[PDB]
């Protein structure tokens, strides 16, 4: 359209959302993955994950303050993906590819899943 495009604005917003998460400012949910807990903003979770979107869009579950993931989900793989959500940077390596891909499929993060497929292809 005719509007001025700020190419860095979305990245600046996300960096500031990550700063708010680092200070626990306005976080409203805890994700439990076995023995670990991770605080986050439900809006960011919904904007990144089909699983979280499907949970919180339902008015029955929108006010949930705790979500328990499947016990077969790897806490390290979840943390890598939560960091990705808030940075646009994905820590993919041969030592973690299968755990990250499993967690991305479970969380319904289609672009990360497509990227992990491309990673396996270029390995
Ligand atoms: N349409 C809409 N509006 C707000 N967030 C989302 N999230 C979403 C839904 C399903 C799949 C993946 C995501 Cl990131 N989608």
mmCIF file of N, CA and C and ligand atoms in Angstrom:
data_model
loop_
_atom_site.group_PDB
_atom_site.id
_atom_site.type_symbol
_atom_site.label_atom_id
_atom_site.label_comp_id
_atom_site.label_asym_id
_atom_site.label_seq_id
_atom_site.Cartn_x
_atom_site.Cartn_y
_atom_site.Cartn_z
ATOM 1 N N UNK A 1 0.825 -1.210 0.000
ATOM 2 C CA UNK A 1 0.000 0.000 0.000
ATOM 3 C C UNK A 1 0.871 1.278 0.000
ATOM 4 N N UNK A 2 0.237 2.464 0.028
ATOM 5 C CA UNK A 2 0.941 3.755 0.013
ATOM 6 C C UNK A 2 1.686 4.140 1.311
ATOM 7 N N UNK A 3 1.582 3.351 2.380
ATOM 8 C CA UNK A 3 2.185 3.707 3.663
ATOM 9 C C UNK A 3 3.696 3.492 3.674
ATOM 10 N N UNK A 4 4.388 4.169 4.610
ATOM 11 C CA UNK A 4 5.816 4.017 4.774
ATOM 12 C C UNK A 4 6.053 2.703 5.547
ATOM 13 N N UNK A 5 6.959 1.868 5.075
ATOM 14 C CA UNK A 5 7.294 0.592 5.715
ATOM 15 C C UNK A 5 8.547 0.759 6.567
ATOM 16 N N UNK A 6 8.452 0.363 7.849
ATOM 17 C CA UNK A 6 9.561 0.368 8.788
ATOM 18 C C UNK A 6 10.004 -1.055 8.833
ATOM 19 N N UNK A 7 11.108 -1.335 8.160
ATOM 20 C CA UNK A 7 11.626 -2.683 8.034
ATOM 21 C C UNK A 7 12.109 -3.300 9.318
ATOM 22 N N UNK A 8 12.506 -2.490 10.306
ATOM 23 C CA UNK A 8 13.053 -2.981 11.577
ATOM 24 C C UNK A 8 12.018 -2.943 12.716
ATOM 25 N N UNK A 9 10.819 -2.369 12.498
ATOM 26 C CA UNK A 9 9.847 -2.214 13.587
ATOM 27 C C UNK A 9 9.414 -3.531 14.200
ATOM 28 N N UNK A 10 9.081 -4.535 13.407
ATOM 29 C CA UNK A 10 8.621 -5.793 14.028
ATOM 30 C C UNK A 10 9.699 -6.426 14.853
ATOM 31 N N UNK A 11 10.962 -6.396 14.382
ATOM 32 C CA UNK A 11 12.075 -6.950 15.146
ATOM 33 C C UNK A 11 12.288 -6.162 16.440
ATOM 34 N N UNK A 12 12.114 -4.851 16.380
ATOM 35 C CA UNK A 12 12.239 -4.028 17.585
ATOM 36 C C UNK A 12 11.139 -4.355 18.598
ATOM 37 N N UNK A 13 9.899 -4.541 18.124
ATOM 38 C CA UNK A 13 8.812 -4.929 19.028
ATOM 39 C C UNK A 13 9.144 -6.270 19.710
ATOM 40 N N UNK A 14 9.576 -7.256 18.903
ATOM 41 C CA UNK A 14 9.837 -8.584 19.468
ATOM 42 C C UNK A 14 10.961 -8.537 20.486
ATOM 43 N N UNK A 15 12.019 -7.754 20.211
ATOM 44 C CA UNK A 15 13.120 -7.592 21.168
ATOM 45 C C UNK A 15 12.563 -7.013 22.466
ATOM 46 N N UNK A 16 11.655 -6.022 22.370
ATOM 47 C CA UNK A 16 11.102 -5.463 23.599
ATOM 48 C C UNK A 16 10.157 -6.428 24.319
ATOM 49 N N UNK A 17 9.443 -7.257 23.581
ATOM 50 C CA UNK A 17 8.630 -8.279 24.233
ATOM 51 C C UNK A 17 9.518 -9.271 24.977
ATOM 52 N N UNK A 18 10.675 -9.623 24.394
ATOM 53 C CA UNK A 18 11.605 -10.529 25.067
ATOM 54 C C UNK A 18 12.181 -9.872 26.304
ATOM 55 N N UNK A 19 12.437 -8.564 26.263
ATOM 56 C CA UNK A 19 12.895 -7.843 27.442
ATOM 57 C C UNK A 19 11.832 -7.883 28.524
ATOM 58 N N UNK A 20 10.540 -7.736 28.161
ATOM 59 C CA UNK A 20 9.481 -7.821 29.165
ATOM 60 C C UNK A 20 9.426 -9.236 29.765
ATOM 61 N N UNK A 21 9.566 -10.284 28.940
ATOM 62 C CA UNK A 21 9.579 -11.647 29.471
ATOM 63 C C UNK A 21 10.762 -11.839 30.443
ATOM 64 N N UNK A 22 11.942 -11.275 30.111
ATOM 65 C CA UNK A 22 13.133 -11.408 30.968
ATOM 66 C C UNK A 22 12.933 -10.773 32.327
ATOM 67 N N UNK A 23 12.011 -9.805 32.441
ATOM 68 C CA UNK A 23 11.708 -9.088 33.689
ATOM 69 C C UNK A 23 10.377 -9.528 34.280
ATOM 70 N N UNK A 24 9.753 -10.563 33.708
ATOM 71 C CA UNK A 24 8.455 -11.091 34.119
ATOM 72 C C UNK A 24 7.363 -10.023 34.115
ATOM 73 N N UNK A 25 7.438 -9.082 33.161
ATOM 74 C CA UNK A 25 6.475 -7.992 33.073
ATOM 75 C C UNK A 25 5.302 -8.423 32.195
ATOM 76 N N UNK A 26 4.096 -8.497 32.803
ATOM 77 C CA UNK A 26 2.850 -8.852 32.159
ATOM 78 C C UNK A 26 2.809 -10.288 31.593
ATOM 79 N N UNK A 27 3.691 -11.198 32.030
ATOM 80 C CA UNK A 27 3.569 -12.589 31.673
ATOM 81 C C UNK A 27 2.286 -13.101 32.370
ATOM 82 N N UNK A 28 1.603 -14.034 31.744
ATOM 83 C CA UNK A 28 0.314 -14.518 32.246
ATOM 84 C C UNK A 28 0.102 -16.005 32.156
ATOM 85 N N UNK A 29 1.145 -16.808 31.883
ATOM 86 C CA UNK A 29 1.005 -18.225 31.834
ATOM 87 C C UNK A 29 2.342 -18.890 32.161
ATOM 88 N N UNK A 30 2.294 -20.087 32.751
ATOM 89 C CA UNK A 30 3.455 -20.935 32.979
ATOM 90 C C UNK A 30 3.264 -22.237 32.191
ATOM 91 N N UNK A 31 4.282 -22.680 31.385
ATOM 92 C CA UNK A 31 4.254 -23.911 30.620
ATOM 93 C C UNK A 31 5.131 -24.858 31.405
ATOM 94 N N UNK A 32 4.580 -26.012 31.755
ATOM 95 C CA UNK A 32 5.287 -27.035 32.529
ATOM 96 C C UNK A 32 5.657 -28.134 31.565
ATOM 97 N N UNK A 33 6.959 -28.474 31.539
ATOM 98 C CA UNK A 33 7.540 -29.504 30.699
ATOM 99 C C UNK A 33 8.348 -30.334 31.667
ATOM 100 N N UNK A 34 7.714 -31.389 32.181
ATOM 101 C CA UNK A 34 8.279 -32.278 33.188
ATOM 102 C C UNK A 34 8.669 -31.475 34.449
ATOM 103 N N UNK A 35 9.958 -31.384 34.829
ATOM 104 C CA UNK A 35 10.334 -30.685 36.059
ATOM 105 C C UNK A 35 10.593 -29.191 35.894
ATOM 106 N N UNK A 36 10.520 -28.676 34.657
ATOM 107 C CA UNK A 36 10.816 -27.279 34.378
ATOM 108 C C UNK A 36 9.572 -26.454 34.122
ATOM 109 N N UNK A 37 9.646 -25.170 34.483
ATOM 110 C CA UNK A 37 8.553 -24.221 34.289
ATOM 111 C C UNK A 37 9.087 -23.066 33.478
ATOM 112 N N UNK A 38 8.296 -22.543 32.534
ATOM 113 C CA UNK A 38 8.693 -21.403 31.706
ATOM 114 C C UNK A 38 7.542 -20.421 31.661
ATOM 115 N N UNK A 39 7.768 -19.176 32.065
ATOM 116 C CA UNK A 39 6.749 -18.125 32.028
ATOM 117 C C UNK A 39 6.750 -17.438 30.657
ATOM 118 N N UNK A 40 5.591 -16.968 30.202
ATOM 119 C CA UNK A 40 5.515 -16.330 28.899
ATOM 120 C C UNK A 40 4.256 -15.506 28.799
ATOM 121 N N UNK A 41 4.117 -14.829 27.667
ATOM 122 C CA UNK A 41 2.922 -14.037 27.331
ATOM 123 C C UNK A 41 2.057 -14.896 26.424
ATOM 124 N N UNK A 42 0.804 -15.166 26.834
ATOM 125 C CA UNK A 42 -0.105 -15.941 26.004
ATOM 126 C C UNK A 42 -0.260 -15.356 24.604
ATOM 127 N N UNK A 43 -0.276 -14.038 24.456
ATOM 128 C CA UNK A 43 -0.390 -13.459 23.118
ATOM 129 C C UNK A 43 0.769 -13.926 22.219
ATOM 130 N N UNK A 44 2.026 -13.912 22.737
ATOM 131 C CA UNK A 44 3.155 -14.335 21.932
ATOM 132 C C UNK A 44 3.058 -15.806 21.605
ATOM 133 N N UNK A 45 2.643 -16.605 22.588
ATOM 134 C CA UNK A 45 2.496 -18.023 22.357
ATOM 135 C C UNK A 45 1.469 -18.324 21.261
ATOM 136 N N UNK A 46 0.326 -17.646 21.319
ATOM 137 C CA UNK A 46 -0.712 -17.810 20.308
ATOM 138 C C UNK A 46 -0.250 -17.374 18.905
ATOM 139 N N UNK A 47 0.541 -16.292 18.856
ATOM 140 C CA UNK A 47 1.035 -15.741 17.598
ATOM 141 C C UNK A 47 2.114 -16.629 16.954
ATOM 142 N N UNK A 48 2.680 -17.574 17.695
ATOM 143 C CA UNK A 48 3.767 -18.445 17.203
ATOM 144 C C UNK A 48 3.404 -19.910 17.016
ATOM 145 N N UNK A 49 2.430 -20.411 17.771
ATOM 146 C CA UNK A 49 2.162 -21.850 17.856
ATOM 147 C C UNK A 49 0.721 -22.204 17.626
ATOM 148 N N UNK A 50 0.466 -23.145 16.732
ATOM 149 C CA UNK A 50 -0.904 -23.580 16.455
ATOM 150 C C UNK A 50 -1.504 -24.274 17.654
ATOM 151 N N UNK A 51 -0.693 -24.951 18.467
ATOM 152 C CA UNK A 51 -1.186 -25.631 19.660
ATOM 153 C C UNK A 51 -1.637 -24.621 20.644
ATOM 154 N N UNK A 52 -0.802 -23.620 20.944
ATOM 155 C CA UNK A 52 -1.198 -22.620 21.882
ATOM 156 C C UNK A 52 -2.325 -21.756 21.385
ATOM 157 N N UNK A 53 -2.333 -21.473 20.087
ATOM 158 C CA UNK A 53 -3.434 -20.694 19.530
ATOM 159 C C UNK A 53 -4.755 -21.434 19.765
ATOM 160 N N UNK A 54 -4.800 -22.720 19.420
ATOM 161 C CA UNK A 54 -6.024 -23.529 19.587
ATOM 162 C C UNK A 54 -6.477 -23.625 21.044
ATOM 163 N N UNK A 55 -5.560 -23.575 22.014
ATOM 164 C CA UNK A 55 -5.928 -23.600 23.428
ATOM 165 C C UNK A 55 -6.588 -22.288 23.810
ATOM 166 N N UNK A 56 -5.833 -21.191 23.759
ATOM 167 C CA UNK A 56 -6.236 -19.901 24.280
ATOM 168 C C UNK A 56 -7.309 -19.178 23.478
ATOM 169 N N UNK A 57 -7.503 -19.543 22.194
ATOM 170 C CA UNK A 57 -8.602 -18.911 21.442
ATOM 171 C C UNK A 57 -9.948 -19.375 21.973
ATOM 172 N N UNK A 58 -10.008 -20.561 22.581
ATOM 173 C CA UNK A 58 -11.259 -21.071 23.157
ATOM 174 C C UNK A 58 -11.524 -20.268 24.450
ATOM 175 N N UNK A 59 -12.700 -19.594 24.554
ATOM 176 C CA UNK A 59 -13.038 -18.823 25.765
ATOM 177 C C UNK A 59 -13.085 -19.695 27.029
ATOM 178 N N UNK A 60 -13.264 -21.013 26.875
ATOM 179 C CA UNK A 60 -13.214 -21.929 28.016
ATOM 180 C C UNK A 60 -11.821 -21.979 28.664
ATOM 181 N N UNK A 61 -10.766 -21.851 27.846
ATOM 182 C CA UNK A 61 -9.387 -22.006 28.294
ATOM 183 C C UNK A 61 -8.602 -20.722 28.252
ATOM 184 N N UNK A 62 -9.187 -19.636 27.786
ATOM 185 C CA UNK A 62 -8.406 -18.422 27.632
ATOM 186 C C UNK A 62 -7.756 -17.898 28.900
ATOM 187 N N UNK A 63 -8.395 -18.070 30.048
ATOM 188 C CA UNK A 63 -7.881 -17.560 31.299
ATOM 189 C C UNK A 63 -6.995 -18.598 32.047
ATOM 190 N N UNK A 64 -6.609 -19.732 31.407
ATOM 191 C CA UNK A 64 -5.724 -20.733 32.036
ATOM 192 C C UNK A 64 -4.374 -20.080 32.328
ATOM 193 N N UNK A 65 -3.830 -20.317 33.528
ATOM 194 C CA UNK A 65 -2.553 -19.749 33.938
ATOM 195 C C UNK A 65 -1.463 -20.817 33.904
ATOM 196 N N UNK A 66 -1.801 -22.111 33.634
ATOM 197 C CA UNK A 66 -0.847 -23.224 33.566
ATOM 198 C C UNK A 66 -1.208 -24.193 32.457
ATOM 199 N N UNK A 67 -0.229 -24.648 31.642
ATOM 200 C CA UNK A 67 -0.403 -25.670 30.612
ATOM 201 C C UNK A 67 0.673 -26.718 30.863
ATOM 202 N N UNK A 68 0.279 -27.990 30.881
ATOM 203 C CA UNK A 68 1.194 -29.117 31.030
ATOM 204 C C UNK A 68 1.392 -29.796 29.685
ATOM 205 N N UNK A 69 2.638 -29.833 29.191
ATOM 206 C CA UNK A 69 2.906 -30.530 27.950
ATOM 207 C C UNK A 69 3.077 -32.032 28.166
ATOM 208 N N UNK A 70 2.967 -32.783 27.079
ATOM 209 C CA UNK A 70 3.162 -34.229 27.022
ATOM 210 C C UNK A 70 4.512 -34.582 27.708
ATOM 211 N N UNK A 71 4.565 -35.593 28.599
ATOM 212 C CA UNK A 71 5.846 -35.934 29.251
ATOM 213 C C UNK A 71 6.982 -36.368 28.319
ATOM 214 N N UNK A 72 6.680 -36.782 27.074
ATOM 215 C CA UNK A 72 7.706 -37.167 26.105
ATOM 216 C C UNK A 72 8.354 -35.928 25.462
ATOM 217 N N UNK A 73 7.822 -34.702 25.714
ATOM 218 C CA UNK A 73 8.435 -33.465 25.209
ATOM 219 C C UNK A 73 9.677 -33.125 26.029
ATOM 220 N N UNK A 74 10.748 -32.843 25.302
ATOM 221 C CA UNK A 74 12.072 -32.529 25.813
ATOM 222 C C UNK A 74 12.118 -31.070 26.352
ATOM 223 N N UNK A 75 12.433 -30.825 27.656
ATOM 224 C CA UNK A 75 12.505 -29.438 28.164
ATOM 225 C C UNK A 75 13.487 -28.555 27.392
ATOM 226 N N UNK A 76 14.638 -29.103 26.988
ATOM 227 C CA UNK A 76 15.599 -28.327 26.185
ATOM 228 C C UNK A 76 14.995 -27.934 24.831
ATOM 229 N N UNK A 77 14.298 -28.845 24.172
ATOM 230 C CA UNK A 77 13.680 -28.551 22.891
ATOM 231 C C UNK A 77 12.596 -27.503 23.042
ATOM 232 N N UNK A 78 11.832 -27.552 24.138
ATOM 233 C CA UNK A 78 10.836 -26.509 24.370
ATOM 234 C C UNK A 78 11.507 -25.153 24.585
ATOM 235 N N UNK A 79 12.564 -25.094 25.405
ATOM 236 C CA UNK A 79 13.245 -23.827 25.665
ATOM 237 C C UNK A 79 13.838 -23.212 24.372
ATOM 238 N N UNK A 80 14.398 -24.038 23.505
ATOM 239 C CA UNK A 80 14.928 -23.551 22.238
ATOM 240 C C UNK A 80 13.818 -22.896 21.418
ATOM 241 N N UNK A 81 12.642 -23.521 21.416
ATOM 242 C CA UNK A 81 11.550 -22.991 20.630
ATOM 243 C C UNK A 81 10.918 -21.785 21.279
ATOM 244 N N UNK A 82 10.847 -21.711 22.616
ATOM 245 C CA UNK A 82 10.337 -20.506 23.280
ATOM 246 C C UNK A 82 11.270 -19.339 22.988
ATOM 247 N N UNK A 83 12.580 -19.591 23.043
ATOM 248 C CA UNK A 83 13.534 -18.534 22.682
ATOM 249 C C UNK A 83 13.337 -18.110 21.246
ATOM 250 N N UNK A 84 13.165 -19.047 20.335
ATOM 251 C CA UNK A 84 12.914 -18.703 18.948
ATOM 252 C C UNK A 84 11.700 -17.788 18.804
ATOM 253 N N UNK A 85 10.619 -18.159 19.484
ATOM 254 C CA UNK A 85 9.404 -17.354 19.393
ATOM 255 C C UNK A 85 9.693 -15.869 19.673
ATOM 256 N N UNK A 86 10.540 -15.607 20.664
ATOM 257 C CA UNK A 86 10.829 -14.258 21.134
ATOM 258 C C UNK A 86 12.084 -13.636 20.493
ATOM 259 N N UNK A 87 12.814 -14.332 19.607
ATOM 260 C CA UNK A 87 14.014 -13.762 18.951
ATOM 261 C C UNK A 87 14.121 -13.921 17.463
ATOM 262 N N UNK A 88 13.392 -14.822 16.826
ATOM 263 C CA UNK A 88 13.555 -15.142 15.412
ATOM 264 C C UNK A 88 14.819 -15.914 15.159
ATOM 265 N N UNK A 89 15.510 -16.405 16.176
ATOM 266 C CA UNK A 89 16.765 -17.148 16.011
ATOM 267 C C UNK A 89 16.573 -18.527 16.550
ATOM 268 N N UNK A 90 16.896 -19.541 15.715
ATOM 269 C CA UNK A 90 16.678 -20.947 16.050
ATOM 270 C C UNK A 90 17.992 -21.683 16.213
ATOM 271 N N UNK A 91 18.218 -22.237 17.389
ATOM 272 C CA UNK A 91 19.426 -23.010 17.654
ATOM 273 C C UNK A 91 19.206 -24.470 17.178
ATOM 274 N N UNK A 92 19.447 -24.723 15.872
ATOM 275 C CA UNK A 92 19.363 -26.066 15.267
ATOM 276 C C UNK A 92 20.775 -26.591 15.114
ATOM 277 N N UNK A 93 21.011 -27.821 15.558
ATOM 278 C CA UNK A 93 22.299 -28.517 15.462
ATOM 279 C C UNK A 93 22.049 -30.013 15.222
ATOM 280 N N UNK A 94 23.072 -30.787 14.815
ATOM 281 C CA UNK A 94 22.870 -32.233 14.650
ATOM 282 C C UNK A 94 22.490 -32.903 15.977
ATOM 283 N N UNK A 95 23.061 -32.435 17.082
ATOM 284 C CA UNK A 95 22.786 -32.968 18.409
ATOM 285 C C UNK A 95 21.382 -32.710 18.935
ATOM 286 N N UNK A 96 20.638 -31.727 18.359
ATOM 287 C CA UNK A 96 19.280 -31.420 18.835
ATOM 288 C C UNK A 96 18.188 -31.434 17.762
ATOM 289 N N UNK A 97 18.510 -31.642 16.483
ATOM 290 C CA UNK A 97 17.525 -31.543 15.386
ATOM 291 C C UNK A 97 16.277 -32.392 15.604
ATOM 292 N N UNK A 98 16.433 -33.637 16.025
ATOM 293 C CA UNK A 98 15.259 -34.487 16.172
ATOM 294 C C UNK A 98 14.393 -34.073 17.355
ATOM 295 N N UNK A 99 14.990 -33.618 18.440
ATOM 296 C CA UNK A 99 14.228 -33.134 19.583
ATOM 297 C C UNK A 99 13.519 -31.824 19.241
ATOM 298 N N UNK A 100 14.184 -30.917 18.509
ATOM 299 C CA UNK A 100 13.558 -29.654 18.138
ATOM 300 C C UNK A 100 12.437 -29.890 17.129
ATOM 301 N N UNK A 101 12.667 -30.760 16.135
ATOM 302 C CA UNK A 101 11.623 -31.034 15.167
ATOM 303 C C UNK A 101 10.408 -31.680 15.862
ATOM 304 N N UNK A 102 10.632 -32.618 16.778
ATOM 305 C CA UNK A 102 9.540 -33.254 17.507
ATOM 306 C C UNK A 102 8.722 -32.212 18.263
ATOM 307 N N UNK A 103 9.408 -31.292 18.961
ATOM 308 C CA UNK A 103 8.738 -30.274 19.740
ATOM 309 C C UNK A 103 8.022 -29.271 18.838
ATOM 310 N N UNK A 104 8.610 -28.917 17.697
ATOM 311 C CA UNK A 104 7.952 -28.013 16.760
ATOM 312 C C UNK A 104 6.701 -28.587 16.142
ATOM 313 N N UNK A 105 6.733 -29.898 15.839
ATOM 314 C CA UNK A 105 5.544 -30.547 15.325
ATOM 315 C C UNK A 105 4.448 -30.584 16.378
ATOM 316 N N UNK A 106 4.805 -30.908 17.597
ATOM 317 C CA UNK A 106 3.870 -30.956 18.702
ATOM 318 C C UNK A 106 3.257 -29.570 18.953
ATOM 319 N N UNK A 107 4.087 -28.507 18.916
ATOM 320 C CA UNK A 107 3.598 -27.131 19.107
ATOM 321 C C UNK A 107 2.958 -26.542 17.844
ATOM 322 N N UNK A 108 3.008 -27.210 16.715
ATOM 323 C CA UNK A 108 2.420 -26.729 15.459
ATOM 324 C C UNK A 108 3.027 -25.397 15.026
ATOM 325 N N UNK A 109 4.354 -25.420 14.856
ATOM 326 C CA UNK A 109 5.120 -24.272 14.403
ATOM 327 C C UNK A 109 5.590 -24.651 13.012
ATOM 328 N N UNK A 110 4.746 -24.372 11.993
ATOM 329 C CA UNK A 110 4.955 -24.858 10.628
ATOM 330 C C UNK A 110 6.232 -24.396 9.959
ATOM 331 N N UNK A 111 6.641 -23.143 10.172
ATOM 332 C CA UNK A 111 7.876 -22.644 9.552
ATOM 333 C C UNK A 111 9.107 -23.266 10.177
ATOM 334 N N UNK A 112 9.103 -23.497 11.495
ATOM 335 C CA UNK A 112 10.209 -24.200 12.115
ATOM 336 C C UNK A 112 10.243 -25.648 11.597
ATOM 337 N N UNK A 113 9.079 -26.304 11.472
ATOM 338 C CA UNK A 113 9.037 -27.672 10.944
ATOM 339 C C UNK A 113 9.590 -27.700 9.525
ATOM 340 N N UNK A 114 9.185 -26.750 8.678
ATOM 341 C CA UNK A 114 9.697 -26.719 7.291
ATOM 342 C C UNK A 114 11.215 -26.456 7.285
ATOM 343 N N UNK A 115 11.684 -25.571 8.150
ATOM 344 C CA UNK A 115 13.111 -25.313 8.274
ATOM 345 C C UNK A 115 13.878 -26.533 8.780
ATOM 346 N N UNK A 116 13.316 -27.281 9.745
ATOM 347 C CA UNK A 116 14.001 -28.479 10.228
ATOM 348 C C UNK A 116 14.041 -29.530 9.105
ATOM 349 N N UNK A 117 13.000 -29.586 8.242
ATOM 350 C CA UNK A 117 13.029 -30.537 7.118
ATOM 351 C C UNK A 117 14.151 -30.148 6.172
ATOM 352 N N UNK A 118 14.264 -28.851 5.858
ATOM 353 C CA UNK A 118 15.336 -28.366 4.978
ATOM 354 C C UNK A 118 16.706 -28.645 5.596
ATOM 355 N N UNK A 119 16.841 -28.538 6.926
ATOM 356 C CA UNK A 119 18.082 -28.861 7.643
ATOM 357 C C UNK A 119 18.466 -30.324 7.443
ATOM 358 N N UNK A 120 17.498 -31.222 7.633
ATOM 359 C CA UNK A 120 17.747 -32.662 7.473
ATOM 360 C C UNK A 120 18.192 -32.924 6.042
ATOM 361 N N UNK A 121 17.571 -32.239 5.075
ATOM 362 C CA UNK A 121 17.890 -32.383 3.661
ATOM 363 C C UNK A 121 19.319 -31.927 3.302
ATOM 364 N N UNK A 122 19.801 -30.847 3.938
ATOM 365 C CA UNK A 122 21.140 -30.297 3.703
ATOM 366 C C UNK A 122 22.225 -30.902 4.628
ATOM 367 N N UNK A 123 21.899 -31.938 5.436
ATOM 368 C CA UNK A 123 22.833 -32.583 6.361
ATOM 369 C C UNK A 123 23.565 -33.724 5.651
HETATM 370 N N1 LIG B 1 -5.138 -16.478 12.631
HETATM 371 C C1 LIG B 1 -4.336 -16.335 13.693
HETATM 372 N N2 LIG B 1 -4.481 -15.210 14.440
HETATM 373 C C2 LIG B 1 -3.654 -15.171 15.486
HETATM 374 N N3 LIG B 1 -2.650 -16.006 15.776
HETATM 375 C C3 LIG B 1 -2.661 -17.103 14.990
HETATM 376 N N4 LIG B 1 -1.817 -18.125 15.305
HETATM 377 C C4 LIG B 1 -1.715 -19.407 14.714
HETATM 378 C C5 LIG B 1 -2.841 -20.182 14.422
HETATM 379 C C6 LIG B 1 -2.692 -21.450 13.878
HETATM 380 C C7 LIG B 1 -1.444 -21.906 13.514
HETATM 381 C C8 LIG B 1 -0.314 -21.193 13.879
HETATM 382 C C9 LIG B 1 -0.462 -19.969 14.510
HETATM 383 CL CL1 LIG B 1 0.955 -19.029 14.819
HETATM 384 N N5 LIG B 1 -3.396 -17.283 13.878
#
